Design an enzyme around this catalytic site. Structure first.
Site, mmCIF file in Angstrom:
data_model
loop_
_atom_site.group_PDB
_atom_site.id
_atom_site.type_symbol
_atom_site.label_atom_id
_atom_site.label_comp_id
_atom_site.label_asym_id
_atom_site.label_seq_id
_atom_site.Cartn_x
_atom_site.Cartn_y
_atom_site.Cartn_z
ATOM 1 N N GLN A 19 0.704 -1.242 0.000
ATOM 2 C CA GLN A 19 0.000 0.000 0.000
ATOM 3 C C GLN A 19 0.728 1.283 0.000
ATOM 4 O O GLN A 19 0.080 2.296 -0.266
ATOM 5 C CB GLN A 19 -1.047 0.175 1.095
ATOM 6 C CG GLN A 19 -1.812 -1.036 1.274
ATOM 7 C CD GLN A 19 -2.621 -1.055 2.589
ATOM 8 O OE1 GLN A 19 -3.102 -2.238 2.857
ATOM 9 N NE2 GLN A 19 -3.001 -0.039 3.284
ATOM 10 N N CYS A 25 -6.193 -0.312 1.881
ATOM 11 C CA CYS A 25 -6.467 -1.742 2.002
ATOM 12 C C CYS A 25 -7.784 -2.181 1.393
ATOM 13 O O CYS A 25 -7.831 -3.309 0.886
ATOM 14 C CB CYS A 25 -6.462 -2.249 3.443
ATOM 15 S SG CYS A 25 -7.560 -1.201 4.503
#
Ligand SMILES: [Hg+2]
Length: 216
Positions: A19, A25
């Site tokens: 990320q 996420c």
């Protein structure tokens, strides 16, 4: 159901990603499930864009979190671009979905696993990668470097990841999770979370909120 499933064995799971500096996420998990049903319906594994959902999925909050079913709704309405035509920048931009070439991957709807029950979850997993939630805020989770993960953790889930398999390993039930924290974390980017049986929020609230894309 099968006693052990691994979508990676199937060619349905793309490399572990990172990320970077963004609470995306939600996007990474919706992406991973969509890559998987994609490869399962078409035979072609491709990588799709998390940055399209950060910039365009207006109900989610960019780099400040988001909701896997909204993202999955996004893909069912709009389809979603090649990771290579709409690359990941780790921050919220304006939505460029309109301007990006390449093929769109398209789905038709979103499946909600009936929550808080083991067999419902594995019935879904035994058909394709599933977006699930986990409480990740615990030190044991952030410092996880391998083994069958049993906690300690609470059920205050705060993190979306992808169930890509499940099975039994030197006799424990687990779920095989693709995280988006790089291959430095956990078992080269995966976690095996202990299966609670039957009706349960799951270990770390693993059963509390499960979605997948429907296609073909
Ligand atoms: Hg997260």
């Amino acid at each position: 159901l099968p006693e052990n499933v691994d979508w990676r064995k199937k060619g349905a799971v793309t490399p572990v990603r990172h990320q970077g500096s963004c609470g995306s996420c939600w996007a990474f998990s919706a992406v991973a499930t969509v890559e998987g049903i994609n490869k399962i319906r078409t035979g072609k594994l491709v990588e799709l864009s998390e940055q399209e959902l950060v910039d365009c999925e207006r109900r989610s909050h960019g780099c400040k979190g988001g909701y896997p079913p909204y993202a999955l709704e996004y893909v069912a309405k709009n389809g979603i671009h090649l990771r290579s035509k709409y690359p990941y920048k780790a921050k919220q931009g304006t939505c460029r979905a309109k301007q990006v070439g390449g093929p769109i991957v398209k789905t038709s709807g979103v499946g909600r696993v009936q929550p808080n029950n083991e067999g419902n979850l594995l019935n879904a997993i035994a058909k394709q990668p599933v977006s699930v939630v986990v409480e990740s805020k615990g030190r044991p989770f952030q410092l996880y470097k391998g083994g069958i993960f049993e906690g300690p953790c609470g059920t205050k889930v705060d993190h979306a990841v992808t169930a890509v398999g499940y099975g039994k390993s030197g006799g424990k039930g687990y779920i095989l999770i693709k995280n988006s924290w790089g291959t430095a974390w956990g078992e080269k980017g995966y976690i095996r979370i202990k299966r609670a049986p039957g009706n349960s929020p799951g270990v770390c609230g693993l059963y509390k909120s499960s979605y997948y894309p429907t296609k073909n």
